[PDB]
Amino acid sequence: HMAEFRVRVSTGEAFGAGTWDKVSVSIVGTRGESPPLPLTAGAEEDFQVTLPEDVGRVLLLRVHKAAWFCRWFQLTPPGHLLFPCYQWLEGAGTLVLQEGTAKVSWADHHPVLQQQRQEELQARQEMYQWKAYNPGWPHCLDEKTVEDLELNIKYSTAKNANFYLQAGSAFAEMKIKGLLDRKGLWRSLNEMKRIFNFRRTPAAEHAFEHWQEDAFFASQFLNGLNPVLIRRCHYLPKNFPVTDAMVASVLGPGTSLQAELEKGSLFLVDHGILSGIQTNVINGKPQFSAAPMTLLYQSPGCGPLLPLAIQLSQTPGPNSPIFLPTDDKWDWLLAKTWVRNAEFSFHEALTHLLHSHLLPEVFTLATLRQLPHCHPLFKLLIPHTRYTLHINTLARELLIVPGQVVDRSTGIGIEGFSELIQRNMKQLNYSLLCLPEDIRTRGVEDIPGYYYRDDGMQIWGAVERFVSEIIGIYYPSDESVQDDRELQAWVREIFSKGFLNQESSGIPSSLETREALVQYVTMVIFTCSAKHAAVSAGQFDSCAWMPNLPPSMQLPPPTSKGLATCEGFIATLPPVNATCDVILALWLLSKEPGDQRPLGTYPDEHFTEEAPRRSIATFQSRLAQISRGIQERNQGLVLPYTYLDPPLIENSVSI
Amino acid sequence: SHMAEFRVRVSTGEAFGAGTWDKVSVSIVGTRGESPPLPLDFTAGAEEDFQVTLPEDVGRVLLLRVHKAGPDAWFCRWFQLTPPRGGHLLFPCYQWLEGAGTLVLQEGTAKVSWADHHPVLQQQRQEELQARQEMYQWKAYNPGWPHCLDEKTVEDLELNIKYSTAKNANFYLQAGSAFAEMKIKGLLDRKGLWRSLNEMKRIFNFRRTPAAEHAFEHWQEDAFFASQFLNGLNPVLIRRCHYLPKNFPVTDAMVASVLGPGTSLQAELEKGSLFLVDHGILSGIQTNVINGKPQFSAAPMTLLYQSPGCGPLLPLAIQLSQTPGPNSPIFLPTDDKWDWLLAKTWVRNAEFSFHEALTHLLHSHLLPEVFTLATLRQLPHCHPLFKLLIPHTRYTLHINTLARELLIVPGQVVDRSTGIGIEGFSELIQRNMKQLNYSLLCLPEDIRTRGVEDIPGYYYRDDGMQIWGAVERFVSEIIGIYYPSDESVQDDRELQAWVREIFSKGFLNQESSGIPSSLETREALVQYVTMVIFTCSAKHAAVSAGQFDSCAWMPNLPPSMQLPPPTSKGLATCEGFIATLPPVNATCDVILALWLLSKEPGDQRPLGTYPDEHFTEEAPRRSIATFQSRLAQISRGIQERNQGLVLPYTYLDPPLIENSVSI
Ligand SMILES: Cc1ccc(CSc2ncn(-c3ccccc3)n2)cc1
Ligand SMILES: Cc1ccc(CSc2ncn(-c3ccccc3)n2)cc1
Ligand SMILES: [Mn+2]
Ligand SMILES: [Mn+2]
């Protein structure tokens, strides 16, 4: 009853993907199990093997080891069966692999495969465990050091070398110039240009030149570091008491303020969440924050969005002036940079960290814990989780720990960041995580020049259509979705570990329809790729000119108008060493250091079936069409929005 | 009316930023009074002549006043005043002119206080000396420690003693990359034991030298463990044994294996073939707590035997405690591999504490800083001793304030990653101050005191005595130029004051030190200045160059131990070897620090290289050129000797020895 197969093995092209250890392979069939059979990087050599007995239909492929990065196996019966791996093998350890054809739990009921799914999941759950990092926070990976991470989720040796090779020179450049050891104020606004001797960019250059333009201050809520906040005002908030006399200049004697509310041209940026937030100490001095509201007016006939009024405090009264554009330059300019400072604290804590990094990590951890290697959802999602656990543990290990940059140079400090995350978690909402629902809800479907909306809506449509073709392949009905016990346990873990079982969040705790499943997968894949890129790519473009994005403030918000001066303004801005401490951090975290794979590109061919590959080719094609329409729209913009060009978007959160 | 026409040539340092757009002018002061400040109506590296006439006749020039106008920093190197109908006057400077002030320069001709009795030149010294005293002051950093510069931050230092911009660039680029690479990896945050001895080879992925590799390949060898006491990082401890110490009892039976039946152990004491390495100063020292785990240290004693006919130096016995007894086993090369190995790693651990606090820190950083701070305060710019010593102090004050600011503060490598910790370092220095003596600072007496003059394979001694001889013959030539007699030395009040401050602020007026508080002979001054020079250059280099080479393999130089030394034989295991070893984050933090401390980060000027022309007269210049060629001859013998050595000794190669302690 002897049997023989041809074994093809493909090792990784990465540094040290090959070993010198011996490798055996067992073959599990429908009849029985085969005895262990003994067999550099980028190698694609074949092997010969003779089963002492035929095990019938091929069910599992076990690969014992005597690290080694395997890509895929290929066995040949007396026909071809691909066993995609794309994992690491360290020391002695066996790896069980099902065939590449994606399989839901109900798809194959033979007992050897069901028992294998659970075993792998029982292992992944002991391998990747949750921890309560902080009260009110999403749960995270329960590891302390990147030295505690497995090779499969660890940062690539090449990519790591890129990151610590750049941070060394970038830190070395700034410390040599004394900028990291000046604990006092900037000599002048003129001296803040020295930052451009460190790193330069046409976006940063544009930010410095148009810094004082109300149209540039008002367009950054649409196309800047944090464009999610802007929402249309149905009414003027009671907290913000603006009058016609305040805006008669910008609006002119033609229209009224209510008359603009009814047209839908009045908009609002509300940083109220920073109200009463705990502040940090920098160089022994107290650091302050505002809780600003800014009124914005959209000009008639596709004109510029213009600000109308700024109230730094969330409490109305005589000691919280409503600064206007018509006010003295230093009063109006000061009010604007208090908002820009409000944007910084809000963006880095919530928009970037809470939504872009913590939520993507919850998606990743639940994917490894609940979806086995052969599940279609795993193959679809796993490339959008790459490196996300490494970059987070790296963040809890290097960024928000006492004595680090958040503690050293932020006006909110680690305390403030945690409180904002705890506060913002309780208002989290499914709509704001679904781009089309978010922009319908905020009432910003109609405002012009909103390139983050235009591009996202484009990218959201492509992913949703890709996801649907994939869900349509493997899920024939709603009943098939409801019966996927692994899928349901995946959404539940996310709802509890990530969203803390909050009902007001509206995040589904279960998926009952294919449409709901498509929507849910799109949101995950989107926030792991396009969403992070749109809030991360322009960090240095926004802070390089420090007044554009101040990380801290050293004087309380002004209680009266007619008091700000050049000297007081500079006095209020952060110190030098803290200015550069953040700028250096934001520069390192604005681009992928190395080994970057663009949205839609899946070199790890987990999908081996013809139907999924056809869907990937179509997805990739559509993304190219979007990238060309963006390049066409940017041809005529003084400042082109490039944060959502698919080619410059990363598959997962790795930076 | 008398009109004076002078040709004024000025050289600007080519250091970046050394040029200035400030309007600089000069004023000449001579026997016939001072002149009106005359402006020169300057880029880095450029030399430029100027022509400006004095309103009156100034007589024979005495001083040159350099004036700068009103925030830039200009580095002047030298002025040159050429009067009409010939003549030359060279005013060496080599200082950063910062802000808006004036420098008072004397002619290059070196002057002892008694050399010129002119009243304006005498007043120039006192005013200069007074400014140096207000500028550089003393402070008691810690009881029992040497006094040091009273500056808190490196950002408070003056540019003249600050690190060179080019140097700051090289060092910070290297320190940035190194620290960033280890921090990003998570090596500085990984608490817990090493997985194995193989995982410790990961260090060589971070950095690697042929010396460090040799320490790994031969780590377990007895001949290599012993040879490190002669040619290693801490080569100043081994001494001859007149008798075996009573506290550490070794019997013929114990060592009969190595010595063989041909000779008794008392016969080897008479033959001078027995040596001892005593780490007793660690006994009862305070330990540190690393990652919440109590750390340990020993106070071992190593008995070493010198094989005849230029045979390898091999260890006879290691006692890990100063108190002998049942719980102080005397380990022998016949014990189990984990026992003998574990014993030797404790000695390696003892070697680390002793070297970094006493050898490298106290002896090669704190005393150099004393010598530096005394010549700044007591020897004026025109003094011959100033000219001779000033290059051997370059950057010492910056690096030492950097140390107290970045190295010995709580939450630094000594605090977090050292088994002894800050307290144990201060305790060691406080203890070692009492044993300090003149004989251990002068290499000839040192090697003779320890009786290590005849031991073979002792490259630190061979090269040291060569370098000491060249520095003394060179020091003797400069001293012979400017002091004609012994009363010349006694008459030099600035000199006697200089030596007086060192004995007080540096040795704490300890009579046991044997350090001169006065200098009566010019033979004694030659010996004193030679000692000062050597300590600043060759001493530090020898103990500094091989820091990473010795600690790359963590077992070879582990910085802390996590278990007490064993009280019994036969209880050692591979598993217990790793358990006792220091944690990973403690390991990589020390290796990162030693890597950055082992070499000069650019801006290197070797022993004998004096780019700044302080000595203008021909006589001192001929001694320098002679001293430089004698050094090159020494360097050539070392290359010839190293040609036939597997592990060459390179730490005392003059070309590789810095003029001053700057790393
Ligand atoms: C002032 C300031 C600076 C930084 C941030 C970071 S937000 C984020 N997300 C991931 N990060 C990371 C990954 C890897 C290593 C370090 C950090 N950082 C917010 C605010
Ligand atoms: C582990 C250890 C213990 C003690 C010593 C004393 S030597 C010294 N002197 C100045 N150092 C320095 C200054 C600034 C930044 C780094 C180092 N290091 C060295 C190494
Ligand atoms: Mn990011
Ligand atoms: Mn040193």
Side-chain angles (χ1 to χ4, degrees):
Chain A
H1 300 109
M2 286 203 322
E4 183 178 2
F5 302 88
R6 177 168 285 182
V7 186
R8 207 133 55 191
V9 189
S10 176
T11 65
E13 304 194 40
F15 316 150
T19 50
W20 280 75
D21 289 345
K22 293 179 179 179
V23 193
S24 67
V25 156
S26 173
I27 299 185
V28 180
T30 62
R31 300 219 39 70
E33 176 185 10
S34 169
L37 305 170
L39 295 174
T40 50
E44 52 186 352
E45 287 180 327
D46 318 338
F47 286 94
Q48 294 300 320
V49 163
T50 291
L51 304 213
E53 313 138 12
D54 175 51
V55 297
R57 188 221 310 171
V58 194
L59 299 181
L60 305 182
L61 183 53
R62 299 200 189 98
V63 181
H64 328 87
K65 195 167 178 294
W68 179 61
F69 183 71
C70 174
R71 291 217 301 266
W72 51 261
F73 280 92
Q74 178 171 0
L75 303 178
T76 64
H80 288 264
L81 275 66
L82 177 63
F83 292 91
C85 183
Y86 299 105
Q87 304 181 49
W88 283 92
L89 278 79
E90 158 75 34
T94 71
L95 295 174
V96 184
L97 299 162
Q98 297 199 13
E99 197 212 24
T101 68
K103 224 77 176 178
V104 199
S105 53
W106 40 253
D108 213 298
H109 271 311
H110 183 91
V112 184
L113 300 179
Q114 295 301 312
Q115 177 177 346
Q116 193 267 311
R117 306 177 72 99
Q118 247 167 353
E119 270 161 356
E120 178 191 2
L121 287 187
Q122 207 66 7
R124 288 184 166 180
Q125 290 175 359
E126 297 142 15
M127 205 67 182
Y128 310 106
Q129 308 183 2
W130 298 93
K131 81 168 154 78
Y133 182 72
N134 195 273
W137 284 49
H139 293 50
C140 75
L141 178 56
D142 182 4
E143 289 300 356
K144 242 308 180 187
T145 301
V146 288
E147 273 284 320
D148 297 354
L149 300 176
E150 309 67 0
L151 298 75
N152 295 324
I153 74 175
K154 199 167 283 182
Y155 232 32
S156 172
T157 169
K159 186 164 182 162
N160 213 36
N162 292 277
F163 190 53
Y164 67 66
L165 274 173
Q166 254 295 358
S169 298
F171 173 91
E173 167 159 338
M174 271 193 170
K175 191 167 193 59
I176 295 170
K177 306 167 74 169
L179 291 171
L180 289 188
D181 295 326
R182 286 193 54 189
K183 308 181 67 58
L185 303 175
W186 289 89
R187 292 185 168 103
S188 67
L189 274 46
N190 214 272
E191 192 191 8
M192 299 162 181
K193 303 153 64 69
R194 294 179 58 188
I195 301 158
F196 289 155
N197 302 122
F198 160 74
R199 297 298 182 270
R200 197 177 308 96
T201 189
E205 294 183 32
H206 184 283
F208 160 77
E209 201 141 0
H210 300 269
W211 167 54
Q212 298 165 44
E213 295 177 15
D214 282 2
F216 172 66
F217 157 84
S219 75
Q220 292 181 95
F221 299 118
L222 302 178
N223 304 309
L225 188 54
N226 184 29
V228 307
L229 273 178
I230 208 173
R231 69 188 301 100
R232 171 178 55 190
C233 294
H234 191 265
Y235 301 105
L236 200 39
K238 71 168 317 179
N239 289 337
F240 206 170
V242 184
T243 61
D244 284 321
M246 302 179 186
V247 298
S249 56
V250 186
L251 308 193
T255 172
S256 159
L257 209 40
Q258 178 197 25
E260 291 298 323
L261 268 184
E262 298 171 337
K263 269 169 297 192
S265 62
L266 287 194
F267 289 84
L268 189 76
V269 188
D270 192 352
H271 296 87
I273 195 174
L274 274 58
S275 184
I277 205 65
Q278 204 162 161
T279 54
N280 209 18
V281 179
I282 295 185
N283 303 332
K285 294 177 64 177
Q287 301 310 292
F288 304 103
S289 178
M293 288 176 296
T294 78
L295 196 62
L296 293 170
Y297 166 73
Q298 176 52 61
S299 307
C302 307
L305 190 62
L306 295 171
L308 300 179
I310 286 179
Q311 193 180 302
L312 292 189
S313 179
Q314 280 285 317
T315 308
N319 293 323
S320 54
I322 296 187
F323 310 88
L324 315 164
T326 57
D327 292 345
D328 63 297
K329 291 319 175 193
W330 287 111
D331 272 334
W332 179 239
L333 196 61
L334 177 65
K336 279 186 287 179
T337 299
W338 273 107
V339 181
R340 289 306 301 169
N341 176 74
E343 276 286 61
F344 170 94
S345 298
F346 187 102
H347 161 270
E348 296 295 1
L350 318 181
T351 302
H352 191 186
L353 181 64
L354 177 48
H355 296 66
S356 298
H357 289 266
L358 302 190
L359 296 194
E361 183 188 5
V362 175
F363 301 155
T364 297
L365 295 174
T367 292
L368 305 179
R369 288 185 62 89
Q370 304 302 333
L371 301 169
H373 194 279
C374 59
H375 199 293
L377 292 171
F378 182 92
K379 311 196 177 222
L380 181 63
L381 293 174
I382 175 61
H384 299 266
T385 66
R386 189 172 74 122
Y387 297 166
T388 286
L389 295 182
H390 187 95
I391 201 63
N392 289 25
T393 60
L394 203 55
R396 287 176 271 103
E397 169 189 7
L398 259 51
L399 212 82
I400 48 186
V401 186
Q404 230 75 53
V405 53
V406 165
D407 194 44
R408 286 189 318 258
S409 295
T410 78
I412 61 171
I414 298 176
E415 295 85 357
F417 261 59
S418 177
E419 196 169 336
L420 281 179
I421 284 179
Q422 303 180 21
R423 280 154 68 156
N424 179 245
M425 273 287 291
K426 298 158 199 181
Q427 58 202 46
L428 200 44
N429 164 245
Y430 194 19
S431 310
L432 72 88
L433 284 170
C434 295
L435 179 49
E437 282 55 66
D438 170 285
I439 294 169
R440 198 210 312 123
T441 288
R442 287 153 56 205
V444 297
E445 293 176 295
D446 309 295
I447 182 171
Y450 197 179
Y451 305 135
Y452 164 76
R453 174 195 67 205
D454 297 333
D455 298 11
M457 287 299 302
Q458 219 69 2
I459 307 193
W460 179 275
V463 171
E464 183 185 328
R465 282 187 288 267
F466 176 51
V467 173
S468 54
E469 279 207 21
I470 290 299
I471 299 310
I473 294 170
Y474 296 95
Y475 289 79
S477 67
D478 302 346
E479 184 176 321
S480 70
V481 171
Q482 304 159 343
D483 291 336
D484 188 335
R485 70 178 67 90
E486 294 159 343
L487 167 60
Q488 300 304 329
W490 172 81
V491 63
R492 208 83 79 182
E493 196 168 44
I494 299 174
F495 175 74
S496 301
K497 297 305 175 173
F499 304 106
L500 313 185
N501 295 136
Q502 294 193 105
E503 302 165 328
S504 284
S505 79
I507 284 74
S509 62
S510 65
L511 292 187
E512 45 287 308
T513 188
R514 301 201 296 168
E515 295 64 47
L517 171 55
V518 166
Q519 190 74 348
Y520 198 92
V521 164
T522 303
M523 175 272 287
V524 178
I525 292 179
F526 185 86
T527 68
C528 288
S529 54
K531 198 230 201 60
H532 174 264
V535 322
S536 176
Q539 304 189 261
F540 176 73
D541 293 342
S542 301
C543 70
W545 183 242
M546 183 257 289
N548 194 56
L549 191 63
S552 187
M553 300 288 203
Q554 323 207 60
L555 294 186
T559 292
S560 306
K561 302 195 285 192
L563 298 169
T565 71
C566 175
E567 308 299 335
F569 173 88
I570 295 187
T572 302
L573 294 170
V576 175
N577 62 348
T579 297
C580 306
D581 186 48
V582 163
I583 294 176
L584 183 55
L586 289 212
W587 187 83
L588 288 183
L589 295 176
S590 288
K591 342 282 171 169
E592 255 78 17
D595 176 59
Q596 47 194 336
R597 313 172 168 188
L599 180 60
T601 63
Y602 307 117
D604 288 6
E605 301 173 348
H606 284 92
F607 287 112
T608 62
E609 292 148 294
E610 172 210 335
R613 290 176 173 279
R614 189 61 177 88
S615 303
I616 300 182
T618 312
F619 186 26
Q620 296 174 339
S621 176
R622 313 282 178 67
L623 291 175
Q625 305 169 20
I626 307 182
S627 184
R628 188 222 53 85
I630 295 186
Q631 95 189 9
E632 168 181 332
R633 177 258 302 161
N634 290 341
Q635 261 186 223
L637 299 183
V638 291
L639 193 70
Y641 189 74
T642 79
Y643 300 154
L644 285 173
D645 193 9
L648 315 182
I649 305 168
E650 180 68 17
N651 262 325
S652 72
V653 175
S654 42
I655 199 58
Chain B
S1 173
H2 300 291
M3 299 279 290
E5 172 69 342
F6 267 94
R7 192 143 204 162
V8 188
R9 178 179 298 176
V10 191
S11 177
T12 293
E14 33 191 354
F16 286 135
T20 68
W21 286 90
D22 273 300
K23 297 165 298 302
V24 167
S25 49
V26 294
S27 186
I28 313 175
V29 67
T31 51
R32 277 199 163 277
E34 205 179 321
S35 86
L38 295 174
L40 298 171
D41 213 351
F42 303 88
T43 187
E47 305 171 355
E48 309 180 73
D49 293 287
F50 290 102
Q51 301 282 350
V52 175
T53 59
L54 288 55
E56 63 185 342
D57 210 315
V58 70
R60 51 208 278 175
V61 178
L62 299 181
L63 305 180
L64 181 81
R65 303 181 92 249
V66 182
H67 307 276
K68 189 168 182 178
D72 207 30
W74 168 52
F75 178 95
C76 163
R77 288 169 33 80
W78 50 257
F79 290 92
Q80 199 192 29
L81 287 61
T82 294
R85 296 163 156 184
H88 275 263
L89 288 189
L90 183 58
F91 297 81
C93 180
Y94 307 109
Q95 313 165 37
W96 282 102
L97 285 67
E98 39 204 351
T102 64
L103 282 189
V104 178
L105 314 175
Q106 299 202 11
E107 174 152 338
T109 307
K111 313 183 204 61
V112 185
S113 77
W114 42 248
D116 203 25
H117 298 302
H118 196 285
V120 175
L121 289 198
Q122 286 289 344
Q123 178 191 349
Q124 199 283 316
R125 311 173 84 93
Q126 280 102 25
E127 295 195 356
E128 174 179 334
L129 286 175
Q130 51 157 53
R132 301 279 192 80
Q133 295 182 4
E134 83 210 6
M135 189 102 56
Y136 313 92
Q137 302 188 358
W138 301 94
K139 71 159 182 171
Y141 180 77
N142 200 275
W145 285 52
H147 293 55
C148 62
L149 172 68
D150 177 15
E151 296 285 18
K152 296 283 183 293
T153 305
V154 166
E155 209 61 18
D156 312 353
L157 303 180
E158 194 180 38
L159 291 171
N160 296 312
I161 54 172
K162 292 216 70 184
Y163 232 45
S164 181
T165 179
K167 208 185 189 77
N168 263 336
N170 279 160
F171 168 73
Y172 274 131
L173 177 63
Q174 289 285 58
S177 283
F179 169 89
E181 166 178 351
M182 269 182 168
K183 233 307 178 188
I184 280 174
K185 284 174 180 181
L187 291 170
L188 303 179
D189 305 302
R190 178 192 170 191
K191 315 182 181 183
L193 300 175
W194 294 90
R195 292 171 60 191
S196 61
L197 293 185
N198 256 276
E199 190 189 24
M200 308 187 191
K201 290 201 299 172
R202 279 218 273 164
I203 289 306
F204 291 101
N205 288 114
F206 158 68
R207 289 300 181 268
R208 194 198 316 258
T209 73
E213 298 170 338
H214 188 265
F216 161 81
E217 216 170 23
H218 303 261
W219 157 56
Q220 299 177 328
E221 302 183 15
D222 282 359
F224 171 70
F225 160 86
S227 77
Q228 291 187 107
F229 295 122
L230 308 167
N231 303 327
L233 59 79
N234 190 30
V236 305
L237 189 52
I238 202 175
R239 71 158 49 249
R240 192 167 53 197
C241 278
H242 205 274
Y243 340 83
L244 296 183
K246 71 171 308 181
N247 69 320
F248 166 46
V250 184
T251 320
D252 281 323
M254 297 180 183
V255 302
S257 185
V258 183
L259 299 179
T263 301
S264 61
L265 188 157
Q266 184 187 23
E268 290 310 297
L269 284 171
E270 296 177 308
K271 299 179 52 53
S273 66
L274 292 187
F275 297 87
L276 178 75
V277 176
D278 195 318
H279 297 95
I281 192 179
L282 296 164
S283 186
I285 206 66
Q286 179 159 9
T287 58
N288 193 26
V289 179
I290 302 187
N291 300 337
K293 294 180 54 184
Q295 300 307 275
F296 298 86
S297 169
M301 283 173 297
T302 304
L303 183 57
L304 306 157
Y305 162 73
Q306 178 51 74
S307 182
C310 289
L313 173 71
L314 310 153
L316 281 182
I318 297 175
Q319 178 165 299
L320 295 171
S321 175
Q322 293 297 304
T323 59
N327 290 6
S328 292
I330 290 181
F331 306 87
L332 318 164
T334 51
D335 300 337
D336 61 356
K337 183 178 179 180
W338 300 116
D339 266 340
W340 192 229
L341 268 187
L342 182 51
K344 289 184 295 182
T345 307
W346 275 103
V347 176
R348 281 273 93 204
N349 171 250
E351 204 68 335
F352 169 82
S353 309
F354 197 98
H355 165 273
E356 291 307 340
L358 304 190
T359 308
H360 192 231
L361 184 54
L362 178 59
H363 287 223
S364 294
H365 272 272
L366 301 180
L367 298 182
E369 176 183 12
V370 180
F371 309 160
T372 295
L373 214 52
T375 299
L376 281 176
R377 289 178 46 86
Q378 304 309 324
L379 298 174
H381 200 69
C382 63
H383 195 280
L385 290 188
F386 181 95
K387 314 273 191 53
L388 178 78
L389 301 167
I390 199 60
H392 301 286
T393 68
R394 191 172 77 115
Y395 300 151
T396 299
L397 296 177
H398 179 196
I399 187 73
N400 276 31
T401 72
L402 205 49
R404 294 178 258 100
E405 174 182 15
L406 225 60
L407 197 94
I408 53 189
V409 189
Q412 272 79 28
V413 175
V414 172
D415 195 46
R416 328 176 288 242
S417 305
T418 299
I420 204 180
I422 293 173
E423 295 302 320
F425 262 69
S426 187
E427 200 168 10
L428 278 188
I429 292 182
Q430 282 176 314
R431 288 184 170 176
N432 186 240
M433 277 292 269
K434 294 142 191 165
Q435 293 177 335
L436 295 174
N437 59 73
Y438 197 22
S439 294
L440 71 78
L441 302 176
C442 302
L443 189 57
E445 286 76 22
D446 169 74
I447 61 171
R448 190 175 48 92
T449 295
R450 301 151 51 202
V452 291
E453 307 184 297
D454 300 315
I455 199 172
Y458 196 2
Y459 314 135
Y460 172 83
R461 174 201 69 210
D462 295 354
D463 300 11
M465 301 295 288
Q466 288 276 291
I467 293 174
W468 180 276
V471 303
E472 179 189 347
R473 281 183 292 267
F474 164 57
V475 174
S476 181
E477 278 204 30
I478 296 288
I479 290 294
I481 292 179
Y482 296 96
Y483 292 82
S485 66
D486 298 338
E487 76 172 319
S488 317
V489 183
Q490 316 163 356
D491 283 352
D492 185 349
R493 305 169 69 168
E494 297 162 344
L495 170 44
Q496 303 300 340
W498 171 77
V499 74
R500 181 62 61 93
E501 207 172 34
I502 290 170
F503 177 74
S504 300
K505 307 294 184 173
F507 303 103
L508 314 168
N509 296 105
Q510 291 184 58
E511 308 155 332
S512 66
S513 67
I515 278 66
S517 65
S518 187
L519 299 174
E520 309 303 322
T521 59
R522 55 202 201 108
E523 289 65 22
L525 181 63
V526 162
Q527 242 276 10
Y528 195 82
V529 173
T530 302
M531 183 282 291
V532 155
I533 296 302
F534 196 85
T535 303
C536 297
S537 63
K539 195 181 190 303
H540 174 259
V543 314
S544 168
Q547 291 185 265
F548 173 77
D549 310 78
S550 285
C551 73
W553 188 230
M554 188 281 292
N556 191 68
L557 186 70
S560 186
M561 304 293 260
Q562 296 198 98
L563 287 171
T567 80
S568 300
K569 289 181 170 59
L571 303 185
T573 175
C574 187
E575 183 169 346
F577 194 76
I578 293 185
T580 303
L581 283 170
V584 174
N585 67 336
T587 298
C588 303
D589 193 43
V590 165
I591 294 183
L592 166 75
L594 269 47
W595 157 265
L596 292 165
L597 301 184
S598 314
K599 222 59 185 172
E600 217 53 55
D603 178 10
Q604 292 146 299
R605 310 174 166 188
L607 185 70
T609 311
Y610 307 131
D612 302 337
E613 307 264 350
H614 277 115
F615 283 116
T616 64
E617 299 143 292
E618 177 176 34
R621 289 164 57 82
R622 280 205 260 248
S623 315
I624 293 172
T626 312
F627 172 50
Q628 288 169 347
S629 78
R630 299 284 172 70
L631 293 177
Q633 299 183 303
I634 304 171
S635 173
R636 187 219 59 77
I638 287 175
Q639 293 177 335
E640 170 174 339
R641 172 259 279 157
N642 286 345
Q643 271 175 12
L645 296 177
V646 173
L647 182 61
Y649 187 84
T650 58
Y651 301 153
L652 285 184
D653 195 6
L656 302 182
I657 303 175
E658 194 69 10
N659 263 338
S660 66
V661 182
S662 54
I663 195 62

